[PDB]
Design an enzyme around this catalytic site. Structure first.
Site, PDB file in Angstrom:
ATOM      1  N   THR H   1       0.847  -1.311  -0.142  1.00 56.92           N
ATOM      2  CA  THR H   1      -0.082   0.149  -0.068  1.00 56.92           C
ATOM      3  C   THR H   1       0.792   1.377  -0.087  1.00 56.92           C
ATOM      4  O   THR H   1       1.875   1.161   0.846  1.00 56.92           O
ATOM      5  CB  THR H   1      -1.051  -0.050   1.196  1.00 56.92           C
ATOM      6  OG1 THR H   1      -1.909  -0.714   1.103  1.00 56.92           O
ATOM      7  CG2 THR H   1      -1.375   1.481   1.431  1.00 56.92           C
TER       8      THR H   1
HETATM    9  O1  LIG Z   1      -4.189  -4.974   1.758  1.00 53.72           O
HETATM   10  C1  LIG Z   1      -4.438  -4.684   2.830  1.00 53.72           C
HETATM   11  N1  LIG Z   1      -4.659  -3.380   2.781  1.00 53.72           N
HETATM   12  C2  LIG Z   1      -4.706  -2.319   1.803  1.00 53.72           C
HETATM   13  C3  LIG Z   1      -5.839  -2.432   1.032  1.00 53.72           C
HETATM   14  C4  LIG Z   1      -6.956  -1.667   1.618  1.00 53.72           C
HETATM   15  C5  LIG Z   1      -6.553  -0.877   2.573  1.00 53.72           C
HETATM   16  C6  LIG Z   1      -5.013  -0.901   2.502  1.00 53.72           C
HETATM   17  C7  LIG Z   1      -4.196  -5.648   3.799  1.00 53.72           C
HETATM   18  C8  LIG Z   1      -2.607  -5.701   4.057  1.00 53.72           C
HETATM   19  C9  LIG Z   1      -2.218  -6.433   5.543  1.00 53.72           C
HETATM   20  C10 LIG Z   1      -2.901  -5.964   6.599  1.00 53.72           C
HETATM   21  C11 LIG Z   1      -2.398  -6.456   7.880  1.00 53.72           C
HETATM   22  O2  LIG Z   1      -3.399  -6.113   8.836  1.00 53.72           O
HETATM   23  C12 LIG Z   1      -4.469  -6.936   9.150  1.00 53.72           C
HETATM   24  C13 LIG Z   1      -5.615  -6.805   9.945  1.00 53.72           C
HETATM   25  C14 LIG Z   1      -6.709  -7.474  10.300  1.00 53.72           C
HETATM   26  C15 LIG Z   1      -6.534  -8.831   9.740  1.00 53.72           C
HETATM   27  C16 LIG Z   1      -5.406  -9.140   8.901  1.00 53.72           C
HETATM   28  C17 LIG Z   1      -4.454  -8.209   8.563  1.00 53.72           C
HETATM   29  C18 LIG Z   1      -5.381 -10.512   8.002  1.00 53.72           C
HETATM   30  C19 LIG Z   1      -6.592 -10.572   7.107  1.00 53.72           C
HETATM   31  N2  LIG Z   1      -6.663 -12.236   6.559  1.00 53.72           N
HETATM   32  C20 LIG Z   1      -5.219 -12.818   6.383  1.00 53.72           C
HETATM   33  C21 LIG Z   1      -5.845 -14.212   5.756  1.00 53.72           C
HETATM   34  C22 LIG Z   1      -7.186 -14.367   6.186  1.00 53.72           C
HETATM   35  C23 LIG Z   1      -7.866 -12.761   6.604  1.00 53.72           C
HETATM   36  O3  LIG Z   1      -8.897 -12.635   6.641  1.00 53.72           O
HETATM   37  C24 LIG Z   1      -5.984  -9.893   5.768  1.00 53.72           C
HETATM   38  O4  LIG Z   1      -4.908  -9.952   5.528  1.00 53.72           O
HETATM   39  N3  LIG Z   1      -7.019  -9.277   5.108  1.00 53.72           N
HETATM   40  C25 LIG Z   1      -6.717  -8.423   3.887  1.00 53.72           C
HETATM   41  C26 LIG Z   1      -7.995  -8.097   3.226  1.00 53.72           C
HETATM   42  C27 LIG Z   1      -7.722  -8.298   1.764  1.00 53.72           C
HETATM   43  N4  LIG Z   1      -8.963  -8.137   0.948  1.00 53.72           N
HETATM   44  C28 LIG Z   1     -10.091  -8.680   1.707  1.00 53.72           C
HETATM   45  C29 LIG Z   1     -11.453  -8.537   0.839  1.00 53.72           C
HETATM   46  O5  LIG Z   1     -11.229  -7.626  -0.213  1.00 53.72           O
HETATM   47  C30 LIG Z   1     -10.892  -6.500   0.193  1.00 53.72           C
HETATM   48  C31 LIG Z   1      -9.304  -6.528   0.741  1.00 53.72           C
HETATM   49  C32 LIG Z   1      -6.045  -7.251   4.434  1.00 53.72           C
HETATM   50  O6  LIG Z   1      -6.357  -6.475   5.540  1.00 53.72           O
HETATM   51  N5  LIG Z   1      -4.867  -6.759   3.745  1.00 53.72           N
END
Ligand SMILES: O=C(NC1CCCC1)[C@@H]1CCCCOc2cccc(c2)C[C@H](N2CCCC2=O)C(=O)N[C@@H](CCN2CCOCC2)C(=O)N1
Ligand SMILES: O=C(NC1CCCC1)[C@@H]1CCCCOc2cccc(c2)C[C@H](N2CCCC2=O)C(=O)N[C@@H](CCN2CCOCC2)C(=O)N1
Ligand SMILES: O=C(NC1CCCC1)[C@@H]1CCCCOc2cccc(c2)C[C@H](N2CCCC2=O)C(=O)N[C@@H](CCN2CCOCC2)C(=O)N1
Ligand SMILES: O=C(NC1CCCC1)[C@@H]1CCCCOc2cccc(c2)C[C@H](N2CCCC2=O)C(=O)N[C@@H](CCN2CCOCC2)C(=O)N1
Lengths: 210, 211, 195, 215, 236, 195, 210, 211
Positions: H1
């Site tokens: 990001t």
């Molecule tokens: O890209 C991202 N941030 C950018 C994109 C939008 C805003 C900026 C982040 C990058 C890492 C974030 C780290 O902090 C977390 C906080 C809470 C939870 C989790 C991580 C673990 C969670 N995990 C891991 C595997 C199972 C699961 O649930 C997970 O990584 N979630 C993805 C979401 C990706 N997509 C989901 C649906 O579609 C939209 C985005 C996610 O948060 N990524």
């Protein structure tokens, strides 16, 4: 134990004939080796016949002193009399134990006079505590703080029964200074209070500053 | 512990305290933290007492053998390299050594800092030990390469005093040696910092000083 | 690390801090304003530590002291302010601590110019000079050496300049931007210094 | 002593979604596994939420069942309280808040919301376990997702092809979904047995089945 | 914990407890607030036994925070508790917004508290009406008046407390806009003395500006009182 | 942390580093000389990491390469030097690692001006520009943006100046003292830069 | 696990009719998210009929490639012939296993031609390895690297038996590009080598650079 | 990001990439990292996707209620304080939120950085995310408050591009919004960085670019 090394410090109580003395180092440490203050007294006057020496963690020293002052002031205003030193000692034990499982990191001593009204007789009173309120009533001397072993050696070797005020001052000051000279985290000044039923003598010793 | 050394126009000043500690208990106040490596090289000890003593005496032996074999005086740079290599060979074993090597040789006056991690840093002004930040601040505040011997000695004394005042690990006596072309002199064999406090900070001696 | 420095004389108290806002390996700002908390009535709280904890604790203290002064239509004494600050920090120490170091300064007619040194454990004492942060190791001896009673404001500022030069030269973080709060003669002045 | 019991298990399986101009395809295999054994070969992963909206999930089966039933309860309550059926977008936001309500003890469920909105646009939302969600034209959750998503990128977006294709239609899209799930079954040990293929378009929701390998 | 409904609807459809609180307010001293371009004048009757009571203690014109002040009529103790609640809310607002509370926000909060105390079991309403002078977020000066029922409005000039109707009618035909500080002060003194004995020690006056709240000196009030006595004698 | 920067053009290669020697929280020196290892025959090894490991590994490499060149009475090729360095680092990686990051530069008639980027794991590749340390995060994009083939030496030095200003302004460690090695036209020049 | 994420990268092998192709990404990562190079090829020519793709830790890639080059050169100079691809594959397995307990963190593939000397017939040869030398002989495709799952999906879906050189190039390039577009730590260019008994065609793809 | 924003003479530029990751797997390339808080305040999302989305929508709700209740527009400072307090209340729970709040209000143009640890920093130029150091270096190298709208947009685009080029966590599309006195405009709705590379770094497209 490392918590007690954070600040350093020690306190010492001694009794003579119709007199009693309380002494402490003046350092406020930080991180066990940095001296941040040289006027941090560990001796607190509860009333004219009751003093407390509080060594240990400085935050806990100040907090406990404030609690004790609150309690003594309430007791004495309600009763319209000065709190007896024994009642205060038992109260301090109860306050420390009330925190038995998350205790104040303090090593208190209580020094004062037990009044026995017939005129009035002034019997020296000394007590040393641990952090959960266990008590050691004594007649010769009490010690507490990270310097406890050195103070114990000096007192066991030098204490003399039934000394007058000047002899008491010299003895307690020598014990404190010799003990402090062997401690890395205590010293930087010494205050000595010699109590008699008539007057209190407050002295600052020309001590080592390293 | 506080040790320091700096170059000035008449040579090198080396100053140390004399306290030794076992934990928070003061084991001694008369230890000797400046060690003659040879006629022209002085070493200072900071950190582990046994490590500094052993490896600086071992360096002394090595240098004696070298100077017999080659009929010449070793350089401070070579002595520091030998020590740094020896110490680096013990990396990870847990040696505690902070050493300043100062001396005169055919390249002039030289000064190196050598620690147990193998660090070897040439320079003109060093301090090691728990109290070394205080000595550094004092020296940097009042350091001039054109100080005379008296001013240099006075500055070294004051820096050691302030270190021992602020650091619980440093104290006892201040020793100030002077390294020159024909060896070294002990300007101040040992002076209790007790008198230094009531000389610098509280000359009145009428009440407790307030930090 | 946040370097804090305080010096009190007979006629003044001076506080100083670096002006850096740090987020990971980058400086968010070279002119941070989240360290000094001026409080109505010739009082000033200076804080170090994490920015979030600094903001929370400092604004809480400032608001509570302002509330006290509005409710009682009077200025809180400096000593009362210092011990209120220490007690609140000590209350939160064993529950959810504010990892912040404090220098508390002020003037009032009862005690003159006051400086209190408080650490993140809520260990507090009144001092003539004090410092917080890793840079405290590099300025404390300078404060000791050059401080004397009857020091003037200009002399004290020269001492602070010595401290800033030492921090720039010898401290691993080369701090060169500073802000100072000078309290003397019934007025509080702000200065910015670059070395 | 006794070790602390872990409250999560992955029961495996894949859910695949693909939007069209006026339709959405949501397919899921029916294997239910525990470590390297098969609990049952028939455990559907898609629940109907409304006449125009279904949900498919992969992860811990107990969590998926509870979440699907909770969402169905909330939607029926919404219908009774507000006199209308919620659109796919409303349900998407509601699912986000439901998931985030357990931000600190998450549902172990990856959910795709599929439906057609009022404008008859095929819609897909795909979720993470804590409520993050995004609208997409194709998506995949579950064990086979990292095998299937590249294939559907290649077929649908064609970002790395100079000579593109723009003739998309329901039959070809269903054939692509079937090929994707079969290819995933070829390589993901947790995807197999049988797939249910749901198609939502103007008329409503239609269900068909395709047999997958059993090994 | 007591929970009886103290304020209830009478058959006529009234909250009699609220009307009784209004009676209490009408038994209070008079307070007047007049608005200007960027300042407001607030005045309030003083009652103090000569040579025995201390005048500096009783405070009917008080400062809520940096920029907002309050005058009140009715029960003093109710006023003290409400004022302390309002100061607390001012500071809470500052903490939660990083900006001082605007005047309109504080007026709305005070009215909300009073309404709430008409609508909770086991409490009686506050027997106080208040005048709140302060600055909005656009730095405009405003004056709000709250009442025991919880109803509020903004005014160019208003009087509360005993004999407030006489003062209101007087202010209607004598108030101008963008008046100078001295003329606004004089108008406030005339308004208050329309219903209170003419004297310097019978009134406290303050002036509100962006800078601070400043009370008018004793000698200035005495000079203005002599001016009023002269105009009265000359008019008779 | 030790910031290292390297940039190779058609007609030159330039290496640059901060000049700080760090011992915990204090700067031992503002003119460190334990980073650059000039090697006979238009070659230069630039190292970061712990000072002890830097000195050991760098002097070992320099001595071995000098030995090779004396024994074979010829200059080692730059590429041979880079891969000898990488292989020795990789030998010690699984036995007693040297925690050092390397930039390797040189000129020879066979390959012109060469720059190799090697990390402490002995991951190596030839690059047109590269950086090591935390300041790499802050200089790499500038290197990318302002670099082009046919860049002149003066242009490359201006790029390095941009990098130094960014490090001084935005990097948590305010690095302001730098040393540069410029190789071009069959001569190696040393420069010092303060920002 | 995370060691393989330190650098990133992947490799892919595919066979057609009298042709075989090997492809790789070109990134050199560091700390899993920093791209330090965009010309770091994972493909190495052992001889004209034997190529190896080495994904994984870059230091181990270079080290293993040097070991393999040493071994192949010694074998071929001693024998005075080109090493057969199967002998090389078995040798690579043995070298990887010789480090069974402190292995090279590499994910190799071998691609080339098995020569069946009658005239000579050129049979495509493909093998994928794990880091301790387990082997997977295949006829259609082989994959390795952190992008393995995406490459497996793309190949299972798109591979077509018995394609000519142009069809093989298009297929392997599409598989690689689609797989790379879903990986955060792989990409930044793709090299594709298409092998025939007569010529080698080396192509660099206009790929994504984020 | 990678998200960024900066003030210039015509208002505020806000630019972001559009990649979302689950571990090292790219979950999406079309996520929307600029969230309209109200008509005049934009928020950027870095860190946890669910956390940023939920708490910025929650802030939107709070601000809607405030602006109904008080018949005025909230300030950017107040919105940032509300968000920072809410997030600080979750300290130690593990929220991952990096947010830049930008907007226009009666005090002018304002910009605050708010992270999960409760940090709240006013400023004129910010960047958050894995790629934020690269965006910072580009912006600081080429930032002038007197840039026109076209120059400001071009600079934001270039900074985002370089971040996505060097950071594996950033990519997809660049969006550049412009905040002005009467709301905001989407100058660049979404532009694939694929074209940006072959526009800036390798326009020739005749061989692989060499870092
Ligand atoms: O890209 C991202 N941030 C950018 C994109 C939008 C805003 C900026 C982040 C990058 C890492 C974030 C780290 O902090 C977390 C906080 C809470 C939870 C989790 C991580 C673990 C969670 N995990 C891991 C595997 C199972 C699961 O649930 C997970 O990584 N979630 C993805 C979401 C990706 N997509 C989901 C649906 O579609 C939209 C985005 C996610 O948060 N990524
Ligand atoms: O003062 C000291 N350095 C100054 C004084 C001279 C040079 C400068 C150090 C200060 C701390 C050193 C830490 O590194 C260590 C390295 C190895 C071992 C130990 C510590 C543990 C060892 N312990 C602990 C209890 C049992 C024991 O054996 C121990 O602390 N030893 C004391 C020696 C003190 N005296 C011994 C005899 O008289 C001369 C000095 C010691 O090394 N102190
Ligand atoms: O003024 C107070 N009460 C007012 C606030 C509400 C209405 C009345 C009392 C003062 C009573 C004095 C008696 O002496 C003690 C008796 C028991 C305990 C302690 C001291 C030590 C304890 N300490 C010391 C540091 C860590 C800690 O836990 C501590 O001071 N507790 C605080 C409560 C602090 N906050 C709690 C939430 O409410 C606001 C205040 C406390 O007892 N205050
Ligand atoms: O030139 C050499 N021998 C001369 C030196 C003495 C007399 C002759 C041989 C070259 C033989 C080439 C054959 O291919 C390999 C065969 C087995 C193993 C490895 C490679 C990988 C191994 N690797 C790679 C990085 C980590 C590691 O352990 C490695 O290279 N081993 C080195 C020995 C290195 N030390 C030897 C003495 O000098 C100091 C260094 C090694 O075998 N060298």
């Amino acid at each position: 134990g490392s918590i007690y090394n954070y600040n350093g410090g020690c306190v010492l109580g001694m009794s003579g004939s119709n007199c009693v003395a309380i002494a402490c180092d003046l350092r406020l440490g930080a991180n066990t080796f940095t001296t941040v203050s040289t006027k941090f007294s560990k001796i607190f006057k509860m009333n004219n016949n009751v003093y407390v020496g509080l060594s240990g963690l400085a935050t806990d020293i100040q907090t406990l002193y404030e609690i004790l002052r609150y309690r003594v002031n309430l007791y004495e205003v309600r009763q319209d009399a000065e709190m007896d030193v024994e009642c205060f000692a038992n109260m301090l034990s109860s306050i420390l134990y009330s925190n038995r499982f998350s205790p104040y990191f303090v090593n208190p001593i209580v020094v004062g006079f037990k009044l026995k009204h017939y005129k009035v007789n002034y019997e020296p009173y000394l007590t040393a505590y641990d952090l959960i309120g266990a008590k050691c009533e004594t007649r010769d001397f009490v010690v507490n703080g990270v310097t406890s072993e050195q103070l114990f050696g000096m007192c066991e070797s030098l204490y003399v029964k039934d000394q007058d005020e000047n002899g008491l001052f010299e003895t307690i000051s020598q014990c404190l200074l010799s003990a402090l000279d062997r401690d890395c985290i205590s010293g930087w000044g010494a205050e000595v209070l010699v109590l008699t039923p008539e007057k209190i003598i407050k002295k600052k010793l020309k001590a080592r500053m390293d | 512990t506080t040790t320091l050394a700096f170059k000035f126009k008449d040579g090198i000043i080396v100053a140390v305290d004399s306290r030794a500690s076992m934990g928070s208990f003061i084991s001694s106040q008369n230890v000797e933290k400046i060690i003659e490596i040879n006629k022209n090289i002085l070493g200072t000890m900071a950190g582990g007492a046994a490590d500094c003593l052993y490896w600086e005496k071992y360096l002394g032996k090595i240098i004696k053998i070298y100077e017999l074999r080659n009929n010449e005086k070793i350089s401070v740079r070579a002595a520091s390299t030998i020590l740094s290599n020896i110490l680096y060979q013990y990396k990870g074993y847990g040696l505690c050594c902070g050493i300043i090597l100062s001396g005169y040789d055919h390249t002039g006056f030289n000064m190196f800092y050598v620690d147990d991690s193998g660090k070897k840093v040439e320079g003109n002004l060093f301090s090691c030990g728990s109290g070394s930040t205080y000595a550094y601040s004092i020296l940097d505040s009042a350091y001039d390469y054109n100080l005379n011997l008296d001013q240099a000695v006075e500055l070294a004394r004051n820096a050691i005093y302030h270190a021992t005042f602020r650091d619980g690990g440093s104290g006892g006596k201040v020793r100030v040696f002077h390294i020159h072309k024909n060896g070294y002199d002990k300007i101040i064999e040992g002076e209790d910092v007790f008198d230094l406090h009531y000389h610098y900070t509280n000359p009145e001696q009428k009440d407790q000083y307030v930090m | 690390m946040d370097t804090l420095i305080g010096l009190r004389g007979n006629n003044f108290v001076v506080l100083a801090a670096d002006t850096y806002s740090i987020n990971s390996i980058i400086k968010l700002k070279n002119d941070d304003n989240t360290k000094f908390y001026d409080i109505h009535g010739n009082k000033c709280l200076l804080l170090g530590g994490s920015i979030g904890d600094r903001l929370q604790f400092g604004e809480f203290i400032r608001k509570n002291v302002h509330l006290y002064q509005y409710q009682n239509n009077t200025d809180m004494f400096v000593k009362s302010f210092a011990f209120f600050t220490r007690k609140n920090l000590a209350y939160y120490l064993r529950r959810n601590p504010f990892e912040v170091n404090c220098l508390i300064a002020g003037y009032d007619k009862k005690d003159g110019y006051q400086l209190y040194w408080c650490d993140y454990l809520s260990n507090m004492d009144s001092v003539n000079k004090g410092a917080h942060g890793y840079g405290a190791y590099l300025v404390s001896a300078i404060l000791d050496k050059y401080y004397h009673e009857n020091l003037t404001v200009d002399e004290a500022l020269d001492i602070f300049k010595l401290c800033f030069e030492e921090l720039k030269k010898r401290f691993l973080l080369t701090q060169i931007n500073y802000e100072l709060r000078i309290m003397y003669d019934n007025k509080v002045e702000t200065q910015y210094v670059t070395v | 002593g006794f070790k602390r019991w872990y409250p999560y298990i992955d029961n495996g399986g894949t859910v695949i979604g693909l939007t069209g101009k006026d339709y959405v395809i949501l397919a899921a295999d029916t294997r239910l596994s525990l470590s390297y054994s098969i609990y049952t070969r028939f455990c559907p992963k898609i629940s109907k939420l409304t006449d125009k909206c279904i949900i498919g999930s992969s992860g811990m089966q107990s969590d998926i069942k509870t979440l699907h039933s909770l969402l169905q309860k909330k939607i029926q309550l919404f219908v009774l309280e507000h006199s209308h059926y919620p659109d796919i977008h409303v349900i998407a936001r509601l699912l986000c808040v439901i998931l985030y309500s357990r931000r600190f003890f998450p549902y172990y469920a990856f959910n795709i919301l599929a439906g057609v909105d009022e404008n008859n646009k095929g819609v897909l939302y795909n979720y993470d376990s804590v409520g993050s969600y995004c609208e997409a034209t194709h998506s995949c959750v579950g064990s086979g997702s990292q095998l299937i998503l590249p294939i559907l990128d290649n077929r649908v977006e064609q970002k790395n092809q100079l000579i593109k294709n723009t003739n998309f239609n329901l039959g070809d899209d269903i054939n692509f979904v079937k090929d994707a799930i079969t290819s995933a079954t070829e390589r993901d040990i947790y995807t197999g047995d049988k797939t249910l293929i749901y198609v939502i378009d103007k008329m409503g929701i239609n269900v068909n089945t395709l047999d997958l390998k059993q090994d | 914990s007591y929970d009886r409904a103290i304020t209830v609807f009478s058959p006529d459809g009234h909250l009699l407890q609220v009307e009784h609180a209004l009676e209490a307010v009408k038994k209070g001293g008079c307070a007047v607030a007049i608005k200007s371009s960027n300042f407001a004048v607030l005045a309030v009757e003083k009652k103090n036994i000569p040579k025995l009571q201390n005048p500096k203690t009783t405070e009917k014109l008080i400062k809520l925070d940096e920029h907002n002040c309050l005058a009140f009529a009715g029960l003093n103790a109710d006023a003290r508790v409400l004022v302390n609640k309002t100061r607390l809310e001012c500071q809470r607002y500052y903490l939660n917004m990083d900006e001082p509370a605007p005047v309109d926000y504080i007026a709305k909060y005070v009215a909300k508290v009073q309404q709430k105390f008409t609508h909770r079991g086991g409490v009686r309403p506050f027997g106080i009406a208040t005048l709140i002078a302060g600055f909005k977020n656009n730095k405009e000066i405003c004056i709000y008046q709250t009442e025991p029922s919880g109803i509020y409005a903004a005014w160019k000039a208003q009087a509360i407390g005993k004999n407030a109707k006489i003062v209101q009618e007087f202010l209607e035909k004598n108030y101008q806009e963008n008046m100078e500080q001295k003329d606004c002060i004089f108008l406030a003194l005339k308004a208050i003395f329309e219903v209170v004995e003419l004297s310097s020690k019978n009134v406290e006056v303050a002036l509100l500006t962006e800078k601070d709240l400043t009370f008018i000196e004793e000698q200035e009030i005495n000079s203005m009182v002599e001016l009023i006595d002269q105009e009265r004698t000359k008019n008779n």
